[PDB]
Amino acid sequence: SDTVDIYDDRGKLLESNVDIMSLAPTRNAAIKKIILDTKRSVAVSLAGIQGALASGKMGGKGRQILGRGLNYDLVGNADAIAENVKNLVQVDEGDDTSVKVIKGGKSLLIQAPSSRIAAGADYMSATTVGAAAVTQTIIDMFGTDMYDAPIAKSAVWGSYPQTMDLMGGNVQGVLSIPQNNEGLGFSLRNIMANHIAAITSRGAMNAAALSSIYEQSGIFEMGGAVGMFERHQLLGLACQGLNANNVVYDIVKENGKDGTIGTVIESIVGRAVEDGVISVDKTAPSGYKFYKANDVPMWNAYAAAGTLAATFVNCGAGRAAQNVSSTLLYFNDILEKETGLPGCDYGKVQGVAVGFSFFSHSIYGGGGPGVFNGNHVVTRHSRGFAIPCVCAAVALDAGTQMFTIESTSGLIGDVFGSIEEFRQPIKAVAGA
Amino acid sequence: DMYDAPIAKSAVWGSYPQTMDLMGGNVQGVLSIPQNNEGLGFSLRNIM
Amino acid sequence: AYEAQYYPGATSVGANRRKHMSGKLEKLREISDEDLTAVLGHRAPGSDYPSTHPPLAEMGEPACSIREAVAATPGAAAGDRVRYVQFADSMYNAPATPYFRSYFAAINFRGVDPGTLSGRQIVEARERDMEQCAKVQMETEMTDPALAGMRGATVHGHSVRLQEDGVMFDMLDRRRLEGGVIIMDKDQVAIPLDRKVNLGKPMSSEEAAKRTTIYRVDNVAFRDDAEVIEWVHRVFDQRTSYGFQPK
Amino acid sequence: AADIFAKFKKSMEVKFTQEYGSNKQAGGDITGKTEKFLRLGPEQDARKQEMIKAGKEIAEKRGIAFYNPMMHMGAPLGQRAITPYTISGTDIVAEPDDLHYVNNAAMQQMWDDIRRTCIVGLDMAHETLEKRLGKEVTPETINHYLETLNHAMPGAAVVQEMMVETHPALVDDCYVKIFTGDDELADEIDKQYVINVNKMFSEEQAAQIKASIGKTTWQAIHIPTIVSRTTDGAQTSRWAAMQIGMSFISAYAMCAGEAAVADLSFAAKHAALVSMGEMLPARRARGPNEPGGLSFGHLSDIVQTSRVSKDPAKIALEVVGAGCMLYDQIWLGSYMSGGVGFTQYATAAYTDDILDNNTYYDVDYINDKYNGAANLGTDNKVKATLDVVKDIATESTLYGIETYEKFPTALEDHFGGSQRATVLAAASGVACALATGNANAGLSGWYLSMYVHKEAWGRLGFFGFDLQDQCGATNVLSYQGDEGLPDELRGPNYPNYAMNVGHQGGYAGIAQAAHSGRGDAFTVNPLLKVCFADELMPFNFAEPRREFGRGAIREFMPAGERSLVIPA
Amino acid sequence: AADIFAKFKKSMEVKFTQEYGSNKQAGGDITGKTEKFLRLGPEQDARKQEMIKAGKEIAEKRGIAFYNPMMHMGAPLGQRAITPYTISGTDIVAEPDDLHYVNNAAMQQMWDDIRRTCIVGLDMAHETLEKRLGKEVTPETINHYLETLNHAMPGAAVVQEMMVETHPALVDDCYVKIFTGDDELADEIDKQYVINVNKMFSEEQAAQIKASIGKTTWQAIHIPTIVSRTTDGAQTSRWAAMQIGMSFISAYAMCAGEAAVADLSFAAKHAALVSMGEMLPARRARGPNEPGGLSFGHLSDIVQTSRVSKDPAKIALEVVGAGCMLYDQIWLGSYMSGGVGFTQYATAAYTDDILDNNTYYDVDYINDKYNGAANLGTDNKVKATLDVVKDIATESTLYGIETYEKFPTALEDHFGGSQRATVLAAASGVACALATGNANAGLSGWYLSMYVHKEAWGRLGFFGFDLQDQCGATNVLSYQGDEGLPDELRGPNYPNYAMNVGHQGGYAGIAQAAHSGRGDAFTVNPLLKVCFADELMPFNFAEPRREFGRGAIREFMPAGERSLVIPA
Ligand code: F43
Ligand code: F43
Ligand SMILES: C[C@@H](OP(=O)(O)O)[C@H](NC(=O)CCCCCCS)C(=O)O
User: Where does coenzyme F430 bind (chain C) (predicted)?
Assistant: First the structure.
């Protein structure tokens, strides 16, 4: 029943003697709130709908329906729109529905009441009710004749339902549609890294933390944290994602000036020895020392912590997202060489990193780090311990990428980045 | 035995995750898997 | 302070691997700044470093406790393009092997993006940071100029039989023995240079054998390295067992 | 139109009053209500005779039973005369069996040409090179890239030593061209690679396309048919991206595999990709570039009649024909079912000039009633109202029904109610769309036609036919999430449409019609319109119906055949 | 085994010491470490010469640039000698380029044969007839049904008047057979339709199969290759069901469309359907019967070597070969990517006897050390432990590595690290599976081989090769939801496996090896085992590696060509 101290992104103590079981997505009120708020929230581009209406450019890439222009000033009327939208989205006056005008009328935050989530199988009601409310509001406020109703509708919904998604539409949340799940319990894993870094305003530790919360909530929903696997996953969540005992931050600090993947390994191994997590099992004829772990899940957590600290140091040094794929690989590979112990996730972080390296430097698919997520074929394989590093890496990029946070995630950043539990997830989990 | 763990697991889970579902497994609820949804908000409609 | 042990094994292959990983490498030759820039092929020798984004000091940086704690490299500070150096290494006792080149980079250099393949190994980094790494690889025992080649594309050769003169096949003939020394007269993507870069004399077969990080049955047999085989077996047993139950 | 009516009567004369094979149908009256049934069976038809002989020969050779018309219950095919079809607007007279997609290389090639095609932007890739590598992109570098690409795309090597490659003689139909809304750029690219928007389109249509896409540059990629046939639709964008990647590596002297290459991949595979169609849900699981994903507007844009014709009806009718063939014969009739399938469900909409007759009548009716509204133009259109739809659709359907009634030949031609319904509703919908420039007004007219049809004859189509019909009128102008959609963006996956023959082709015609009435350069996607404005493609997208005729008479050469590597 | 080692030597001699085309590679030593590079370029090879000429001519004819080896950066292919491959276990010496799937009709047909196949139970349909209509099903009614079905299935009519049909000469590869675990029923069905379990299998294997499926009756359906090539795998079960339905209606005088018919549809489409594989998630969206859905066990069962051989190693090796070809060349190298693709990634595991050498050595080592454990039998098998795997896999890999080191020709053959990795791990895995009868012990062996390899050479495969490797050992015996699975049920959609070359075919081989060591009748599905126990199929499933050779020398005749209806 491990206890940890939780520290923020500046190495300040937030909460002492936290039992890790209290950090479980299934137990922790703050994580549940993050999850519920993520499920129930969507962004709406009023500017996008307005443009689609006037030009006929709706329904996907290249699309334009000529001769059907509707000139509606959505942006100039965003407050009245938000009010009407709230009236439609809400279930009962005074419930937890919220609708906020963002960026001077260009965008809306819509938070559907939690009743819709309670009454739903999943989270899509936020999108469908959000889009429905905006569609109805536009039709009413602007007096769309019924023969133009299809045009008004698709300005919002895009190509749905010819497409399975709202392709070329103007409503989206942080999640993707359920049918994009590769696996069972994967919805919370299907969040682009760029989205995470946008929402946390490029705060690298906060990016990693927010990502860890979603990832581990994913693992939990996958049934990957049952029995002995619960401690295992929560140790990782604490030590890697929530700066347990300030180790991640401390390691960064001591490696910040001149440190490399190599020196971060030394930091981790040094601590593991000091803290009694590992010991020398046997000295080989050459003098090489073979280690064994005294506590296997705890060793794994140290490796997870190390993997992230290494990301912060290596991507940090280069101010370059791409360094993350090799960091994850070589941190773990060299760690095993150093100790004769398994790397993080018993080879699975290194595994992800091998394919992730390839799929972030080759012709075949993937892209820059920012496009990856826990549901992505390339980076799904580790149990939550890889993707937080990727979100950190993306946060740290100083402008090497073509697919920037803005290009993929600007709307999401503008809308969700305003929400403090998302922007400050360590504080959220620590009750601060 | 750990060398028989794969057999015990699949007795329960079937062909998952080669298949998207627990095909030929022994755990089922009233609903279907999310990815079987034709549309958005359809999970509760997918009951035989 | 924890001192790294790097890698198991008591054979010469062990000692060499540990040298590669620790960066404790013998300097064997020199390459001028301008000659190195030339073969790398990313900009004119002596020219300013082009940039991909404005310098950190010019555009400012988001509030981030990590950015604040971790010093940018000179290359990151200046907004350099990320460019690369890539090498092929003969399986016929080239000093370097791909993984060990990558370990060398990861251990000894800040802000690096090493990648390991069978036929090639690359380091991507901010241009000026990368050059310092390329310099070390090029000047030390890590690279033999006959058994290895700097190749950004068309890397084929690592697994191919040697030429009779002991040089590893290059489809694009970027470097070759001239007058007992290796001359590189093309860049790493085989665009001809206006210069002949003298990479000095190659190692004898005997010397390469003693310096190599590769095992071979006709040199230092892997079969006989009980200590490294034990390492593999230990990691294997742990990974297997812990994937069933981590305890 | 008198000329189309004359053609219709000629089609009836040819089909029913001149002997075909040995069917003994020499002479008679196309208006008469009677027929003599000779019970000749299948042998009266030359094609069936050939089929019967092959069937018996193969059965004996292979040692297991095969095609045998005597396996038909009660009696073999052709207890009434087996009669031919004329491809509408042509004098091509076809054997019925030659219009089955399996038997028709032109139909197979039309699908292959769509399946194996995608469109990929160049701008993002160029920006990647400039930003990450500091490379300068010029006309010269583009030309070098395009030559590289034309070597690499069919399946040949640019970087590695000791590569095996596809045989050029097997992949001759594979190539990449570019098109650009940047007139200056266009003039500096080697003409061999360019689809010239200013040459292929009228000045007004070119101007619209250019205004729509701005100064952007695009690759029109057609991968090998042989590959497409080995694999699937979802292969297409993957294949294109791989060779685009290799070509960038080679042409621009990049690292053969660095971080910047992944940006190129992402651009090619996602950010700057335009597929023909998107994926389909689990019940009918399919990846991109399958018929189900192909929106009605996309099909309208692939078909090239809009580019070469000033006749709104003709343009719409070509789309109907292409759509009925693809969506019913290949998609619904094979991909979604199979067996004998749905040849004649589709042929009804592109043979014998019956649909054309109804449509051209409508154009005259509209022009008389609505001040020349059916003529090409934007100022002359009438606002879509229930009243206008009721007027045009009712009149269209009454006229179509009366024609079937005055010509028992036409009724016997379109012997299935479904066929008649498609024809009647297609003319109604096309007419409403032509008049209003509103595609959904076209849909309203389609549905109204069905309602009139049903009440007139006390029957409609097959058992399941009017699922989408009865949901039809109400879902036209719905704005509900899974109901609302402009027809231009609708497709085979629009829920109501997901199952049934006799509709999807009509909806494509309706989409096109709203735009051809207006003289618009495209229906929903200028990128597809330009992509297919290319005579190098095997299938002639400007004349789809005629192409089906060419296939029927075995004059169409498809790509993808394997005789080079087969025993002779 | 001395005979395999000698055969490996001969392959190295043919490839490297005898001249091929104009490569001047006469004379020399297979153990020597040097080569003279003549920089002859592509023309040294006869196929390349032909490809070059075709490319130039086609480019000229079509008016857009095409195949041109001078577009390769730096220098054209073949700066070192271009040398051939021998199909392992044969004397077929092939041109490298002739083993590209595009260039090779046997490879395409192998995929076609699988894609176009499904298995549909008959029992459920018979119960329907009995329950709802009160029909008696007898051998005679079934015989009539099967005659009807063999007429209808290729695309011919049994019910309606005025139907068009597929041309029999285009669809001669389509047929339906039955198999049954009911010996009495088997004896009463017309032999032309029966896959005779008692004739096709050994007595032991027949008994295992019959005990598995009990007294159930199944249709082995192969729809037309021409249709499969026009459409997709998801077509197959739909096509089967349509014609099954029509045949029931006709053969049993049902109403042509009544409620009971829907029951037959559900049974054929769902309740009694066995697909080759299931559907794939959105990122790689595809319906059933695509390569990605084909479990390793399924592939093991399709390949028929298990039925005609009693050599466990030979059986596994055939599966490796079939697997690397399909999974790497067609699936990963086309469906999931494309371009030049992955010929030699795959050929490494079915040519030059290198894999065979390592594997057969392993058999000897096992038999010596584990009291004949690798010989065919069940009670001679050793229980899977870490110790057993470490012993066998380590020995295997060391030997395979030493071979590559002692024979520079072999190293140069398998020039890519990935190729060598597949070879070494395949042998290790097959070896471990052979000794233990535990397929997952085979997987442990596969991963350990990779681990040893990497440390020995300080390199492994391509950039992305060991994603599944490094996840490999730990996921072998995981019981976590999306981790745990017996290798028999694993396939290209097992998450770690979903991307990378050089693995899937090995895993198929390992699955087979666990069962062939035991002399088992099947690896995971007896239905597939019996379905493909049928010499009428175009592809010889008993000898896939040889078949690839037959395709390379242009002696394989594929189905589905359209020359009948194409200009001559
Ligand atoms: C551009 C890449 C980066 C990437 O993502 N994929 C490439 C691309 C290349 C392209 C090469 C076609 C061409 O030459 O134009 C294709 C054929 C994929 C396609 N687009 O169809 C491919 N590799 Ni790759 N590629 C291969 C291989 C390899 C081996 C070759 C090493 C050597 O020493 O020659 C190495 C990886 C490694 O070191 O392990 C490799 C690298 C790389 N692979 C480098 C190019 C390396 C170079 O500059 O020469 N391939 C192989 O290891 C074996 C066979 C093989 C391929 C096709 C076949 O199987 O026949 C293939 C297939
Ligand atoms: C068995 C069914 C029930 C069902 O689900 N499908 C059938 C079956 C048949 C099978 C017929 C092949 C064969 O004869 O063996 C196929 C070709 C589908 C397949 N399996 O390939 C089919 N129908 Ni149907 N089927 C058709 C039609 C029709 C029309 C025929 C009415 C008339 O007066 O002849 C009616 C529906 C209606 O009343 O509107 C119809 C009925 C029915 N349709 C009745 C058989 C009717 C009968 O007993 O004769 N089809 C048509 O209306 C037009 C063309 C047409 C088909 C193929 C093509 O388009 O060429 C087709 C296509
Ligand atoms: C990664 C993923 O690509 P995306 O990231 O979705 O663009 C995936 N491709 C692949 O896995 C390619 C596999 C075959 C080529 C490489 C084999 S080493 C796919 O297309 O669905």
Answer: 118-119, 154-156, 158
Pairing of strands A3-7, C82-89: unpaired
Burial class (CB in 10 A: 0-12, 13-18, 19+), C57: exposed
Question: Do residues E99 and E333 make contact, with C-beta atoms less than 8 angstroms apart?
Answer: no
Backbone break loci in chain C, preceding residues, C–N > 2.5 A: none
What was the resolution (in A) of this experimentally determined structure? Answer: 2.0
Binding-site residues of D sit at 160, 238, 269-270, 283, 345, 463
Q: What is the DSSP letter of D291?
A: G
Please tell me which of the candidates E282, E295, E478 has its beta carbon nearest to residue B18.
E295
Question: Which three-class secondary structure state does DSSP give residue D223?
Answer: coil
Sign of CA dihedral A308, A311, A317, A320: negative
Strands E93-94 and A13-19: unpaired
Tally of CA atoms within 13 A in the half-sphere of C105 that contains its CB = 36
Chain length of chain A = 432
DSSP assignment string, E408-458: HHHHHHT-SHHHHHHHHHHHHHHHHHHHHS-HHHHHHHHHHHHHHHHHHHT
- Structure tokens, D58: 């193969």
**Which residues fall within 8 angstroms of residue E140, CB to CB, at 6 or more apart?**
none
The backbone torsions φ and ψ at residue D519, rounded to the nearest 5 degrees and listed phi first, read 75, 20
Contacts of E25 (CB under 8 A, 6+ apart): E16, E17, E18, E19, E81, E83
Judge contact between E349 and E321, C-beta under 8 A.
yes
Rounded to 10°, the helix D504-516/D417-436 angle is 20
By the 8 A CB rule, do E295 and B15 touch?
yes
Lookup: tokens for C207: 């010397």
Atom of ligand 1 nearest to the CA of E461: 39
Residue E270, helix vs strand vs coil: helix
Q: D482 to chain A nearest CA, in Å?
A: 5
| Contact assessment for residue E518 and residue E437, using Cβ atoms and an 8 Å cutoff | yes
| Tally of residues, chain E | 568
Catalytic annotation present for D464: yes
E324 vs E336: CA distance, rounded Å: 14
CB contact under 8 A, E484 and B7: no
Q: What is the 3-state secondary structure (H, E, C) of chain A?
A: CCEEEEECCCCCEEEEEEEHHHHCCCCCHHHHHHHHHHHHEEEEEHHHHHHHHHHCCCCCCCCCCCCCCCCCCCHHHHHHHHHHHHHHHCCCCCCCCEEEEEHHHCEEEEECCHHHHHCCCCCCHHHHHHHHHHHHHHHHHHCCCHHHHHHHHHHHHCCCCCCCCCCCCCEECCCCCHHHCCCCCCHHHCCCHHHHHHHCCCCHHHHHHHHHHHHHHHHHHCCCCCCHHHHHHHHHHHHHHCCHHHHHHHHHHHHCCCCCHHHHHHHHHHHHHHCCCEEEEEECCCCCEEEEECCHHHHHHHHHHHHHHHHHHHHHHHCCCCHHHHHHHHHHHHHHHHHCCCCHHHHHHHHHHHHHHHCCCCCCCCCCHHHCCCCCCCCCCCCCCCHHHHHHHHHHCCCCCCCCHHHHHHHHHHHHCCCHHHHCHHHHHHCC
Q: Which of B35, B40, B41 has its CB closest to that of D282?
A: B35
Whole-angstrom CA distances from C74 to A360, C56, C57 are 24, 10, 12
What kind and span of H or E run contains D117?
strand D117-121
Helices marked H in D63-128 = 105-115, 123-128
- For residue A169, CA distances in Å to A45, A50, A272 come to 9, 11, 51
Give the DSSP H or E segment for D313: helix D312-323
User: What is the best residue among D148, D153, D160 to mutate for testing ligand 1's pocket, by most ligand atoms within 8 Å of CB?
Assistant: D160
- The DSSP letter of residue D290 is S
CA distance C12 to C208: 11
